[PDB]
Design an enzyme around this catalytic site. Structure first.
Site, PDB file in Angstrom:
ATOM      1  N   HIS A  36     -62.436 -24.620 -48.396  1.00 44.64           N
ATOM      2  CA  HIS A  36     -61.946 -25.643 -49.129  1.00 44.64           C
ATOM      3  C   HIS A  36     -60.354 -26.372 -48.439  1.00 44.64           C
ATOM      4  CE1 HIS A  36     -60.327 -27.598 -52.570  1.00 44.64           C
ATOM      5  NE2 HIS A  36     -61.165 -28.659 -52.420  1.00 44.64           N
ATOM      6  N   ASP A  55     -53.859 -23.862 -51.493  1.00 44.19           N
ATOM      7  CA  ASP A  55     -55.767 -24.206 -52.316  1.00 44.19           C
ATOM      8  C   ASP A  55     -56.107 -22.483 -52.166  1.00 44.19           C
ATOM      9  OD1 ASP A  55     -57.960 -25.317 -51.232  1.00 44.19           O
ATOM     10  OD2 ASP A  55     -56.919 -27.049 -52.064  1.00 44.19           O
ATOM     11  N   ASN A 107     -63.416 -34.737 -61.007  1.00 41.41           N
ATOM     12  CA  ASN A 107     -64.389 -35.144 -60.276  1.00 41.41           C
ATOM     13  C   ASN A 107     -65.665 -35.245 -61.066  1.00 41.41           C
ATOM     14  OD1 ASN A 107     -63.208 -35.035 -57.765  1.00 41.41           O
ATOM     15  ND2 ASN A 107     -63.378 -31.927 -58.017  1.00 41.41           N
ATOM     16  N   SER A 109     -60.221 -33.864 -53.918  1.00 41.37           N
ATOM     17  CA  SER A 109     -60.076 -32.656 -52.946  1.00 41.37           C
ATOM     18  C   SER A 109     -60.134 -33.114 -51.372  1.00 41.37           C
ATOM     19  CB  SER A 109     -60.584 -31.792 -52.876  1.00 41.37           C
ATOM     20  OG  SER A 109     -60.910 -30.761 -54.231  1.00 41.37           O
TER      21      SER A 109
END
Ligand SMILES: N=C(N)NOCC[C@H](N)C(=O)O
Length: 279
Positions: free
Chosen positions: A69, A39, A161, A224
């Protein structure tokens, strides 16, 4: 063990019903397992990680998470308050820049890195990788995820998403990895969650409280956020000896809460991750 006033998603994964707020789990808590968070990085100094997090690789000028994130996702895997597997070891691999963007070639390199790097780590109970990222369909990206899984790592990937069929996204569309959709606290499919035959499981993804950079916390939403619930659950179940990296996605689907989510399109699994823990 019981964690009172837990984030709703933790309570959900140990419950046969929505609407409770205590997380119940075996005290082994993923001890002896390892989870790679591929990530934007991890703020390993966050008190919530208790020294159990470390950066192992970056493709950029720093290994620090300048975004948040990756720290949030790592917190859902394994932070003391916000995590599923509260005693796992967390390894950060920074394939995304501080704006959250990354080239597929770097992401592929990061996956192959984990497949080798696990041989440099002590993970007697098993190894998991959490990939809260993706983009358009790429056979090379899917193949990298398949290699990582084949090497003996439980790979959990976000479905995406776009409120669309995940077959058009990677690594979401790779059949051999665990593709994770998102749900909300009322057991509805999250409004943004991708769907389709390639999904294996849903996890909590709307309004998820976890760690953030600057030693802070915040609530955000996405597939996520659902993915690290499943990654942490896999690590927890592997520490318990109930499953293995090769079989954990199927085991999680076998043992999921079934038929409880609303707005699941015809042809998408109606399965919500569940730890089946009995105190
Ligand atoms: N999973 C089954 N069938 N029973 O476990 C009961 C759940 C228990 N209250 C817990 O600690 O979560």
């Amino acid at each position: 063990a019981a964690q009172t006033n837990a984030p709703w998603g933790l309570a959900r994964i140990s419950s046969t019903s929505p609407g409770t707020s205590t997380y119940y789990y075996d005290e082994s808590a993923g001890q002896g397992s390892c989870v790679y968070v591929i990530d934007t990085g991890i703020e390993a100094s966050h008190p919530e990680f208790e020294g159990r997090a470390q950066m192992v690789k970056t493709y950029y000028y720093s290994s620090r998470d300048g975004n948040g994130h990756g720290t949030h996702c790592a917190g859902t895997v394994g932070s003391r308050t916000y995590g599923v597997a509260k005693k796992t070891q967390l390894f950060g691999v920074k394939v995304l820049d501080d704006n959250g963007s990354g080239q597929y070639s770097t992401i592929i390199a990061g996956m192959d890195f984990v497949a080798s790097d696990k041989n440099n780590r002590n993970c007697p109970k098993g190894v998991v990788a959490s990939l809260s990222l993706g983009g358009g369909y790429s056979s090379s990206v899917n193949s990298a995820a398949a290699r990582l899984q084949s090497s003996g790592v439980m790979v959990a990937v976000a479905a995406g998403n776009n409120n669309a069929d995940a077959r058009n996204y990677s690594p979401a569309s790779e059949p051999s990895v665990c593709t994770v959709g998102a749900s909300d606290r009322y057991d509805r499919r999250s409004s943004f969650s991708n769907y389709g035959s390639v999904l294996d499981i849903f996890g909590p993804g709307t309004d998820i409280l976890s760690t953030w950079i600057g030693g802070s916390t915040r609530s955000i939403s996405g597939t996520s956020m659902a993915t690290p619930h499943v990654a942490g659950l896999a690590a927890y179940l592997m520490t318990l000896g109930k499953t293995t990296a090769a079989s954990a996605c199927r085991y999680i689907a076998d043992t999921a809460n079934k038929g409880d989510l609303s707005n699941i399109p015809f042809g998408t699994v109606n399965l919500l991750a569940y730890n089946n823990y009995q105190a």
